[PDB]
């Protein structure tokens, strides 16, 4: 066959269902109908205690657990991706995997609108030109056609420059560390002469 490439490669057995769920929802152009139908089901477990009894209670028979789920999802225009997923997770008793699929469905979705989050920490609050010169620095730290959003915080422990935090890497072009990276270079070099 031929499925779309998932943007991220993820972990296993709950992140592995979510990347299969993303791939059949990218083939059907249902990447946001399936996503909010997950988000409805997250809310459906909070309100109905007998719906979450179909995911935690081990003494629910599997013939009950797949017939409550199918006869409840037969209408209301749910995606055929969704009501096939939910009878599959109810066949195996994996309905409690659903908080963990929804989290990994988000990370595949947010890497599909290449929107990457950010946090910029500066010394004092920015100008409108200090904002514009900074994204020109910062979209050279995302390696594709990605867009950075931003989040602006302040710290006068920095002496100007900035710290960009991407939640999996940071880049420190602040001059408070440029001082320390200068000092330790000349504290190493006078000991080499």
């Amino acid at each position: 066959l031929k499925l779309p490439t998932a943007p991220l490669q993820l972990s296993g057995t709950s992140a592995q269902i979510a990347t299969l769920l993303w791939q059949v929802a990218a083939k059907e152009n249902q990447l946001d109908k399936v996503q909010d139908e997950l988000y409805q089901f997250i809310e459906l477990f909070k309100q109905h205690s007998e719906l979450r009894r179909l995911a935690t209670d081990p003494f629910v028979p599997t013939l009950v657990r797949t017939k409550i789920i199918s006869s409840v999802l037969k209408d209301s225009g749910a995606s055929e991706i969704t009501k096939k997923l939910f009878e599959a997770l109810a066949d195996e008793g994996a309905l409690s995997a659903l908080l963990e699929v929804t989290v990994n469905y988000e990370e595949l979705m947010l890497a599909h609108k290449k929107e990457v989050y950010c946090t910029v920490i500066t010394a004092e609050p920015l100008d409108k030109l200090e904002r514009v010169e900074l994204t020109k620095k910062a979209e050279k730290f995302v390696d594709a056609g990605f867009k950075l959003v931003m989040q602006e915080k302040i710290d006068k422990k920095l002496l100007g420059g900035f710290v960009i935090e991407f939640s999996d890497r940071r880049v420190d072009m602040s001059t408070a560390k440029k001082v320390e990276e200068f000092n330790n270079f000349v504290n190493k070099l006078v000991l080499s002469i």
Binding site: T13, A88, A94, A97
Partner: peptide, 29 residues
């Protein structure tokens, strides 16, 4: 928190995706 029962899943099958892929793929047009 009332959703905290579902935060940690454990499965009865190591090959759970091989059953899930046999029901999600024929949901495609």
């Amino acid at each position: 928190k009332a959703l905290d029962e579902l935060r940690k899943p454990k499965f009865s099958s190591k090959y759970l995706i091989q059953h899930v892929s046999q029901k999600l793929i024929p949901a495609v047009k």
